[PDB]
Amino acid sequence: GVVHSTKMHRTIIIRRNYLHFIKKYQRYQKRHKSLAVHCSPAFDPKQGDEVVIGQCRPLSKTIRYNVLEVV
Amino acid sequence: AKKHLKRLYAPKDWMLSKLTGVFAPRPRPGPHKLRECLPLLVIIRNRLKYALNAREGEMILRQGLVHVDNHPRRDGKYPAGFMDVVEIPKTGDRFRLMYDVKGRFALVNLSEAEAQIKLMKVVNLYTATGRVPVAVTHDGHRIRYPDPHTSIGDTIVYNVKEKKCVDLIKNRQGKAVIVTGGANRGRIGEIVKVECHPGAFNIAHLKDASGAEFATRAANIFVIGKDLNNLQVTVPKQQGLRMNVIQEREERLIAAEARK
Amino acid sequence: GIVRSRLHKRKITGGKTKIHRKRMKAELGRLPANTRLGARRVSPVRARGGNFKIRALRLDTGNFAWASEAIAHRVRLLDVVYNATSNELVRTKTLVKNCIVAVDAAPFKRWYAKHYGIDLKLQREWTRRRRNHRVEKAIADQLREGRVLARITSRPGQSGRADGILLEGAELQFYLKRLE
RNA sequence: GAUCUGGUUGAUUCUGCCAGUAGUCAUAUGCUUGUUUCAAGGACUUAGCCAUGCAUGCCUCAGAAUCACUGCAUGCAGGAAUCUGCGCAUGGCUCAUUACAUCAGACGUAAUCUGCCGCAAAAAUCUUGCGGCCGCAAAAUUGGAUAACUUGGCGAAACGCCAAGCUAAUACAUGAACCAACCGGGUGUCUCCACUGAGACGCCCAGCGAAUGAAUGACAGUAAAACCAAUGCCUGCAGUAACACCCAGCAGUGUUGACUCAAUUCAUUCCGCGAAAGCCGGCUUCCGGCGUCUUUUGACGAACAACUGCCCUAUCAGCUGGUGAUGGCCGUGUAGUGGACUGCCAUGGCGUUGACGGGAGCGGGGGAUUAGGGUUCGAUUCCGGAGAGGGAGCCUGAGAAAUAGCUACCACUUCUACGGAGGGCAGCAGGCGCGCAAAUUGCCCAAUGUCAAAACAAAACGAUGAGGCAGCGAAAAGAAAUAGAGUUGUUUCAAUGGGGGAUAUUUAAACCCAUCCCGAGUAACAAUUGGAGGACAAGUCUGGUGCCAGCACCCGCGGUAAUUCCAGCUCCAAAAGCGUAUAUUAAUGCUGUUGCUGUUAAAGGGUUCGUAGUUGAACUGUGGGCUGGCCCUUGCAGCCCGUGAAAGAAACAAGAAACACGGGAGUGGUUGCAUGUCAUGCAUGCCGUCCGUGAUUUUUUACUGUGACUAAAGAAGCGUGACUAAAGCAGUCAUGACUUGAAUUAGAAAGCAUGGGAUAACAAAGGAGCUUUUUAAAGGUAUUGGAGAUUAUGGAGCUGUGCGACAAAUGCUUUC
RNA sequence: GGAAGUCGGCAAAAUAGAUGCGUAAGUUCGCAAGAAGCAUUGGCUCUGAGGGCAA
């Protein structure tokens, strides 16, 4: 995903953009999803960057992922 | 806490008719899984016709007349599964449970010598108290001192009369296997290569005796011998060779015409 | 009773969840122990699966370890001195995990004399033991004063025990300044 | 079957609606109905209210009988009853709630719990008898209490109760030394060496599981040699798993993609753990079936999390917000993760790609209709969820926030001697209401299952309104009677069912079907429901009525000569069925993606600017040469496959090249003589790859081809003369065989592996932030027997000097 | 008991400070508004936050 916001402490918001197919009108439409990810002090991502995240146990009310690599 | 099983929800391999009852016998926990077993009542009433109904099945089973792995079993809900040995000494019958080429359960007749051993697949290895290595098997057995070369993919030849291991077969590139699950269940092939995808399912590529290629997941293969010509167990009649559907129908039509 | 489900919480959109099922026993909570310092008193609790939790109401003794020497001793607890959650817990003298306490230092002094022959048979293994070994001045100062600071490492409301470890190194200096 | 017809005009050609027409396991109502097979059946409205009865219990050879119980002669049993152990959290019913909830496909728990079932494990423990704390011995002959029962009873009753006396255990409590091992930690008296070291001896303490603390849970970037002290082996460094004797190989080696996990040692601390102190059987012993405590792993489950998808509405545009809203830190609570919760801190999280609010709805598998694309239904058999009048709370238990369990309140409601005591059909039958709208207060455990103290049988029959069977039943679906053949100008001939019975058959018992006989001539054993101007098949018929009565889905008939009303006759359509009403699919290219219209029929905004959004120009790119005068068809083979340049250098290849790993490769892949002998040494020898780890740098997505993984029922269809068929999965042929059969396919989207590069998408950039190699020199880990220290010499990188060789995509013998 | 008294609620009773939450129709958009209404408050022993100038 791509980094959307970095305002929280040690946690970021990422966005996943994708195309969804409608069968009746044989065409696509744009959609997106948002996730909260824990970011360790080993990385320093910036808005607009791309990251790789991996699933883990629940860490807060919304956090289920951890940053593994920054591209 | 489920203790019933509707007939429509029962496995298709049991071959129970939809019109002759609402329920089917629910297997108990035991050596084999509920979805991959065959309860003793189904073996004795259907398949073999020694019992005409459940009342006669109970009479036979609760006397201890049926032995599974050299032990009398008195429960009609006991789950029997792949590579189990079933003996009825009063009748004088010995069978092994296998998969035919179509993936259905098959009873293979055995000689007295062949009825003393069974093949066991390792599924886990751990250390018990006192630093004792233990190997866990696909049928729930726990072996307390396996061979130091044992791995999770291997097969153990096990003597059930003496309760002792005799041989070990390793999962390698040049070994013969049989498929125990999926769309290719019952096919016998030879390993060509194994693909490793860490964190996901490994994929095995196999070659049939006729040269046909097929693949399965690594958790569905069972080593049975060092090559396609030296198998340590007896297999069903078709020898695990899938046959063309068009060809198979043509032979059946010809056989019917000649028989009549 | 007390529940631990997320049904009563708001959604991240701020909307309200409409609940269409009653409360289940598999999501319960229970009242806190609030363990205090005093003569021993515990209460057993039957938890899920038939197992028992020991709920400690009052404790005054524990098993405390000196990590550098890899030993342990049973000593009497004297006071609660610091708590990171709030100092109202220090005022009431509540025992919880990771709180700082002062324990009796007499058993540790006796072990030092009997193991190194140092006061703070022919076979003198003491000379071998003192070789390439030294003690910190911060610890020895407290051992002479009578009481030494320690950190609770167990959960008294879950196991009924109050065990801990002595403070050494930079962690000791951190809490000494916060108490000064 | 990829189909249309009637109605706007005096005539015509359009747009456009109204009407006609065919289905519905799709409901209800009207008129009719001989035979047989297969079936739905109080969901819609009132998750409204309920009289009565029944729906969950269990005993074997193998847990407890002194019934003042019963036979028969000391052994039995319906052994009544009670205590004990297991179950009652399943099944059945219903659809009220519900939109980041539930659910489907696909996944996780390394965040957890788990009775019954399978395969396993077990060396802690000072007990008993006798005699006088000690001594002698060993098949440890352990203790107290309660039911049933008896006596006295209380109360109008109550699935309500009191006191006393007896007595069982597989209920409860207590409790086992020596036989009987290996291994370790801490400490005192004796011998010896040297001037410390070794060995006794004593003395402690060392089981499974739980808690805290400390170690282990490997290695896998350089090699030759000195110097000290302590050690090993030779008579100075050859040879060399480790270890001061009983053991000279009694672990130098757990698993995973990954672990603070498995397991082991040390210190301190629990303060749950019987060999049931059990029961039968076979032969004085021996042997065999059960039963139970603790520990540990499979299986069967439970609980939690969420990758993609999931109706209408803007006359609903802002929502949440330390008052928990998004996140952080130390805690608490939980079986466990977590704002789940307390304290303190920061100011976040969501929204036109539709948040928040409102409305109608349980979600799927699937049903109807359809050339294709689609539209619509799904309370209801299988799977998932939720509930038991409403709402909360809880005990027991492995599992419940249980309701044919408990507690309270609210609304209804039953009995009473007035003191008090009860109730929960959205289980099966039934009843009242409500309505357009839906069965018998029946028989049985024979089959299918579930429970369990349990094969069956024998004095000797477990329960089961789950489930099955029949009764009612034109919802719907198959097959099918109401005759047939003849001779002359109205008279004969056979045949058969409906029906009535059977030595019988079926069935748990009955019933139905099937099999077989006394029986048809108005074969009275008698067919109906709608129509006859047009759409639309079928009358200039005959009476009656006279814009009245009435018909008519639409257009229209009826005012004294009605093709249309009321009737008779005769004809038409479908036929054991046929009309009417209301919904819904097609008809409908009248919702249009495929595929509609917008000058005048309804419809281009008065004109511009502009943000999300949709759409967006070209280019990096003919491979060539030889066989069967250019070019093109074929079949051949082989090419550094433009040009340079012959082990290297050009081009590629992170799927690759560099490094290293004997705990890498079933023993280290492929191309009777020695070593040891104290030996279970019973031993040991006669170039391309594989596997682990480090260094070095880079391409996705999308589309498309395969493959993997994916409940039945339902759909498609392979075989099969249930007499055919709707069906079903069976059956066929000569002390049995067919080594019988039950094939195969499609199922959205998302997720998984791989190969192909044309059309495209994402991201980056905005072009001045843009050399290699070979020798000489100066400066600053590993091997020496192993273990601990000090030390030079070198490897390698860091750099500043000279030298040799070769390139350069832009001329330095150059420009200014 | 609570306006029945009286021409008439005259007179009397009644409300009440401070702080948090909350607040209708109408409107000249300023108000209406202290609209209406709900809750807390003593004493004692503690804890936190809010500064200056001297090295």
Ligand SMILES: [Mg+2]
């Ligand atoms: Mg009981």
Ligand SMILES: [Mg+2]
């Ligand atoms: Mg935490």
Ligand SMILES: [Mg+2]
């Ligand atoms: Mg729908």
Ligand SMILES: [Mg+2]
């Ligand atoms: Mg209410």
Ligand SMILES: [Mg+2]
């Ligand atoms: Mg009823």
Ligand SMILES: [Mg+2]
């Ligand atoms: Mg007529």
Ligand SMILES: [Mg+2]
């Ligand atoms: Mg007329």
Ligand SMILES: [Mg+2]
């Ligand atoms: Mg008043």
Ligand SMILES: [Mg+2]
């Ligand atoms: Mg008055």
Ligand SMILES: [Mg+2]
């Ligand atoms: Mg008056």
Ligand SMILES: [Mg+2]
């Ligand atoms: Mg006044």
Ligand SMILES: [Mg+2]
């Ligand atoms: Mg006020």
